[PDB]
Amino acid sequence: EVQLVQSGAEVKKPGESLTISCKASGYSFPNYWITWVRQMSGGGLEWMGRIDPGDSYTTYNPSFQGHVTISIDKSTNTAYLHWNSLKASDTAMYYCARYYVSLVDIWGQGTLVTVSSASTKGPSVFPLAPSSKSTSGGTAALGCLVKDYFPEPVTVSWNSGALTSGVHTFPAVLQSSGLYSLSSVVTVPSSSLGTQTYICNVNHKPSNTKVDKKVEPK
Amino acid sequence: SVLTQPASVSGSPGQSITISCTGTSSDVGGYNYVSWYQQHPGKAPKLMIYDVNNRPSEVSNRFSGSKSGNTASLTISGLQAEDEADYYCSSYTTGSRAVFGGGTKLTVLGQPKANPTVTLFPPSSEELQANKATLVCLISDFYPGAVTVAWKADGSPVKAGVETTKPSKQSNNKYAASSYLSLTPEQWKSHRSYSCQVTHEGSTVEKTVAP
Amino acid sequence: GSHSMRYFFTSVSRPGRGEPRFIAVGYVDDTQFVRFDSDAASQRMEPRAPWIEQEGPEYWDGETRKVKAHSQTHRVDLGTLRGYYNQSEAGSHTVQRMYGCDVGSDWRFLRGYHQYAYDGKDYIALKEDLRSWTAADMAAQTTKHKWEAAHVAEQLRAYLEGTCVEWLRRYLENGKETLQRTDAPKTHMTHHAVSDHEATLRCWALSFYPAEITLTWQRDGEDQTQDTELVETRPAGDGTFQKWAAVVVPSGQEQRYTCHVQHEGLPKPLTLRWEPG
Amino acid sequence: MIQRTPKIQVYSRHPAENGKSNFLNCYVSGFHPSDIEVDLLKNGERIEKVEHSDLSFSKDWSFYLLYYTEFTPTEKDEYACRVNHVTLSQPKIVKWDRDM
Amino acid sequence: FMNKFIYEI
């Protein structure tokens, strides 16, 4: 049983160069090409190109021709995919695959590359006050808006972690600005808004940011 | 793209579903080299069916393949929750190449329908004090995990500065998503009422906020 | 060439009787070692020589996949060619393909070839330089432009100068006792009187390998080609070959005639005579 | 379409000796197209279990095949090869001569 | 060892 083992994930910026690799463990008879495939977030499988390990003969997809270079080292059974200059459109998952005669029979585990142009920025936290029209005799929703931070992740606790029931931190959104934003919402009984204090605690490790925002009724 | 698959199919556990894969006489109708791959979120494709109806010994015999003319079919019998993934077909073309389908998202309905819970927050005064205005529309506890969010200002559709996440599994295996309408303090005060419209399984729920 | 590996593919459309016949055979010199028959039961590439049987499961799965890819490509070719020549799928048509390589005495690449025929006639062929095509008619010009646009010649060249030679070398070593042997011909002469004045001298060569051989009759040491009957070299059925040559001599003049045998297993040519009695 | 007439040779694998087992061969070659019927006859009757080689062809694209079966010459039994082909006006029978 | 590459006529 042969498996393709790709190189680790890459965090890059536009203009930088990149080379991801794919080593085929074990041996196989020379009946195959090595194929590189791009899968953008939520997209299908895009055939980028392929190479014959025997003679390094390379075929590219006309859409990827000239933007990327595929090479091989038959002495180590390692295939390479090289960008001369990353463009931040290349942010996607990249798979190597083996095309054996008439079939793609094995896939590499994938190499996620992320090309962001944003700089490290701590978030600004805004309170999401509970609606003054909250359900009397029921529950109310309050939270914190963690806005315009980079990079992932951010940590949101409530009342120094002493409040866990009702907490729902939503996954972040990636805006067209390159920065992230998320919201954490705690559902509390409406009868606690007048007496109990709710403090959200936003911690952003890659920028040494710790913000504690009080969410008060009105 | 070169091969045509349905964008999504659904099924109940224990039932059977079929995914179609349409090509031309040069790939699907010309050769008996149709392949099928299963892809769970975050993971690599895995070979399930090759050579139209052949199957690896390690792949469950609940998966089978067939072909007729220019359309190939994958059938999964006795649906289990683990079968919920993306499915891609591929065919041989001349020159020993391969063309892929667009992919099909399979949903296995393991829970009853759950209508979404929508809470819409206005821009905070702390944020308005910084010449910013963000409307936070949060959706939670819906199933199956597919919603579309449309924003409206006094009834007219607003598609500008809208950032929406995709559905994501909660701890209770229901789904959640959020949408952000970024505005200016002037645009926030220039309209009577903004609105977040969430559509789930045909039904549309609405939440409105005013200055 | 000292040694050669060749693959032969025949495709025969069968109107009214189902899928087209497909028969593929591979040879190392004059020795068949693999076969595939579409009508056979196994639907796999089968061995026909003892040394290729030592190859493991991946070899046979690979060859089976490659020959089935050739089988299905030929199935499309039959339809395409009928479209080129405007033929109404009611007649049986034949497609033949042959490719392979020769090596020199040092087992290194000497020449490669890739030939394609339609209905027993040349259609398109790779030139000796393995870079350009020779198209036979207007239909082959369409195939040529398509193959030039797809860089087919560059990729056939890599197999013919590379993979083909490498696996020939492997076969010649693993099957040295079959492929590198020389069985000198066992030779005898027979005498058949056709009348009281004439007789036929028949010079035999049997159980020889490889098939390349030369039988010549001489009279007073002069070649008698324009009076010699030669059957084509024929297979014995056990990996060896046979051949004979005959001349009609006047009764009493048999001692003037000699048969000369040339073969790789003979260091010097053999002279055969007929000894009345 | 090119058509070529088959050449036929009937012969034994080894020099025939009455009483010793042998193989009767019929070698058809140089014919086109590949549709051909070949039978081995013993005293006029068709021999049932007759094997054949795998279809191949020569440099002029014409085909060749080897039909063979196990037999034992008896100095009195007649053997032959019946061949039929589109290029033939009638089925051709070639008797087995031990001296050829 | 056959060729892994083949193209339609």
TrEMBL record, chain C:
One Gene Ontology CC term in the entry: MHC class I protein complex
Cell location: Cell membrane; Membrane
Keywords (A to Z) from UniProt: Disulfide bond, Glycoprotein, Immunity, Membrane, Metal-binding, MHC I, Phosphoprotein, Signal, Transmembrane, Transmembrane helix, Zinc
Residues binding Zn(2+): H151, E154
Signal peptide annotation: none
GO BP of this protein: antigen processing and presentation of peptide antigen via MHC class I; immune response
Record-given protein name: MHC class I antigen
Organism field: Homo sapiens
Positions spanned in the full protein: 1 to 277 of 341
